[PDB]
Design an enzyme around this catalytic site. Structure first.
Site, PDB file in Angstrom:
ATOM      1  CG  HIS A  61      -1.702  -1.258   1.403  1.00 52.10           C
ATOM      2  ND1 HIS A  61      -2.701  -1.652   0.540  1.00 52.10           N
ATOM      3  CD2 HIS A  61      -1.615  -2.224   2.346  1.00 52.10           C
ATOM      4  CE1 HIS A  61      -3.207  -2.802   0.949  1.00 52.10           C
ATOM      5  NE2 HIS A  61      -2.563  -3.173   2.041  1.00 52.10           N
ATOM      6  CG  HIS A  91       2.618   5.685   6.207  1.00 51.69           C
ATOM      7  ND1 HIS A  91       2.352   5.560   7.546  1.00 51.69           N
ATOM      8  CD2 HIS A  91       1.534   6.304   5.659  1.00 51.69           C
ATOM      9  CE1 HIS A  91       1.140   6.053   7.787  1.00 51.69           C
ATOM     10  NE2 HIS A  91       0.618   6.510   6.660  1.00 51.69           N
ATOM     11  CG  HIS A  93      -1.078   8.502   2.328  1.00 46.35           C
ATOM     12  ND1 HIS A  93      -1.870   7.375   2.306  1.00 46.35           N
ATOM     13  CD2 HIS A  93      -0.723   8.673   3.623  1.00 46.35           C
ATOM     14  CE1 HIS A  93      -1.990   6.897   3.534  1.00 46.35           C
ATOM     15  NE2 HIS A  93      -1.293   7.656   4.357  1.00 46.35           N
ATOM     16  CD  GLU A 103      -4.355   9.412   3.241  1.00 46.26           C
ATOM     17  OE1 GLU A 103      -4.055   9.336   4.446  1.00 46.26           O
ATOM     18  OE2 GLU A 103      -4.904   8.487   2.594  1.00 46.26           O
ATOM     19  CG  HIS A 116       0.063  10.203   7.480  1.00 47.58           C
ATOM     20  ND1 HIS A 116      -0.916   9.488   6.816  1.00 47.58           N
ATOM     21  CD2 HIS A 116      -0.236  11.516   7.345  1.00 47.58           C
ATOM     22  CE1 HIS A 116      -1.782  10.355   6.318  1.00 47.58           C
ATOM     23  NE2 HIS A 116      -1.394  11.583   6.619  1.00 47.58           N
ATOM     24  CB  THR A 195      -6.262   7.746   6.105  1.00 48.29           C
ATOM     25  OG1 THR A 195      -4.931   7.301   5.846  1.00 48.29           O
ATOM     26  CG2 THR A 195      -6.270   9.002   6.940  1.00 48.29           C
TER      27      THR A 195
HETATM   28  N1  LIG Z   1      -2.557   6.561   7.226  1.00 52.43           N
HETATM   29  S1  LIG Z   1      -2.583   6.470   8.813  1.00 52.43           S
HETATM   30  O1  LIG Z   1      -1.444   7.130   9.356  1.00 52.43           O
HETATM   31  O2  LIG Z   1      -3.883   6.875   9.296  1.00 52.43           O
HETATM   32  C1  LIG Z   1      -2.424   4.733   9.245  1.00 52.43           C
HETATM   33  C2  LIG Z   1      -3.320   3.834   8.693  1.00 52.43           C
HETATM   34  C3  LIG Z   1      -3.277   2.504   9.085  1.00 52.43           C
HETATM   35  C4  LIG Z   1      -2.351   2.017  10.013  1.00 52.43           C
HETATM   36  N2  LIG Z   1      -2.368   0.676  10.428  1.00 52.43           N
HETATM   37  C5  LIG Z   1      -3.387  -0.279  10.063  1.00 52.43           C
HETATM   38  C6  LIG Z   1      -3.618  -1.283  11.138  1.00 52.43           C
HETATM   39  C7  LIG Z   1      -3.473  -2.614  11.205  1.00 52.43           C
HETATM   40  C8  LIG Z   1      -3.902  -3.013  12.504  1.00 52.43           C
HETATM   41  C9  LIG Z   1      -4.274  -1.910  13.136  1.00 52.43           C
HETATM   42  O3  LIG Z   1      -4.110  -0.814  12.324  1.00 52.43           O
HETATM   43  C10 LIG Z   1      -1.427   2.963  10.511  1.00 52.43           C
HETATM   44  N3  LIG Z   1      -0.336   2.548  11.405  1.00 52.43           N
HETATM   45  O4  LIG Z   1      -0.322   1.391  11.795  1.00 52.43           O
HETATM   46  O5  LIG Z   1       0.532   3.358  11.683  1.00 52.43           O
HETATM   47  C11 LIG Z   1      -1.464   4.308  10.154  1.00 52.43           C
HETATM   48 ZN   LIG Z   2      -1.095   7.519   6.376  1.00 55.01          ZN
END
Ligand SMILES: NS(=O)(=O)c1ccc(NCc2ccco2)c([N+](=O)[O-])c1
Ligand SMILES: [Zn+2]
Ligand code: NA
Length: 257
Positions: A61, A91, A93, A103, A116, A195
């Site tokens: 992703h 990471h 986007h 985003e 992020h 997100t």
């Molecule tokens: N774009 S973001 O910063 O909101 C973001 C999105 C998904 C996940 N994780 C997805 C996930 C799997 C199990 C629980 O969580 C993360 N993270 O983990 O830093 C960050």
């Molecule tokens: Zn993110």
């Protein structure tokens, strides 16, 4: 499984993750004229001097730069936050072209990319427990625009050739995330969500007002990554962003007058 394409992208996520239509989803558009200055918001305390990066992973992703979060080595506190939040990963986007990729948006403006930095609230002991809590996470979001190169990003850019496809990782020790910040820590903040699936509503979002500049060549290298695994048809890793979601019953606060 979920992704960013026509048949598995953001418009489909609600079927497996009904919280996609929830009350505090992210990202959002930041309407700058209605985000009210909150003089009780504190300066953001970003303490990354002791950060220990470990590895970079293409997860199909995006790519994640992972940190040793077994001690309070890189932490975020202050601002809107109560207590201490430990850096676990960062990471990005980004888009297929410079006119989209972020985003969050600012008065409907889309930036070329968005960084992020993900942190979890140490009062819950581990990330997995933190994501069962409405104040479990704090994500520091930083916009990228295309202009001059960001020197502190180049080490990331140069390792991407080695993690082209989903499931590949590489050692990535001794990376200093301080080199990804802008000068100002002025920010907007609001309560939201992850997100990507599982879209959990655990996040205090802190979105910096000042973008960082990266060069066209730097973002072009992001766009050479692949969503697919090795030995599968090539799907360029581009447009891995979720569009803005309804603000609903929330207020975005500004740290600055
Ligand atoms: N774009 S973001 O910063 O909101 C973001 C999105 C998904 C996940 N994780 C997805 C996930 C799997 C199990 C629980 O969580 C993360 N993270 O983990 O830093 C960050
Ligand atoms: Zn993110
Ligand atoms: Na407002």
């Amino acid at each position: 499984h979920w992704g960013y394409g026509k048949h598995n992208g953001p418009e489909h996520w609600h079927k497996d993750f009904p919280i996609a239509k929830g009350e505090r989803q992210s990202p959002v558009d930041i309407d700058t004229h209605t985000a009210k200055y909150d003089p009780s918001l504190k300066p953001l305390s970003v303490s990354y001097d002791q950060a220990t990066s470990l590895r970079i992973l293409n997860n199909g992703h995006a790519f994640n730069v992972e940190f040793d979060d077994s001690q309070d080595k890189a932490v975020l506190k202050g601002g809107p936050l109560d207590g201490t939040y430990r850096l676990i990963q960062f990471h990005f986007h980004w888009g297929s072209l410079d006119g989209q990729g972020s985003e969050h948006t600012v008065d409907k403006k889309k930036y070329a990319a968005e960084l992020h930095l993900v942190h979890w609230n140490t009062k819950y002991g581990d990330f997995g427990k933190a994501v069962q809590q409405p104040d479990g996470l704090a994500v520091l979001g930083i916009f990228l625009k295309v202009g001059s190169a960001k020197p502190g990003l180049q080490k990331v850019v140069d390792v991407l050739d080695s993690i082209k496809t989903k499931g590949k990782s590489a050692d990535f020790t001794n990376f200093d995330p301080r080199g990804l910040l802008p000068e100002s820590l002025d920010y907007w903040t609001y309560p939201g969500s992850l997100t990507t699936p599982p879209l959990l509503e655990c996040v205090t979002w802190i979105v910096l007002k000042e973008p960082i500049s990266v060069s066209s060549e730097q973002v072009l290298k992001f766009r050479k990554l692949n969503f697919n695994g090795e030995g599968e048809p090539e799907e360029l890793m581009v447009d891995n962003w979720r569009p803005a979601q309804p603000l609903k019953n929330r207020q975005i606060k500004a740290s600055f007058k």
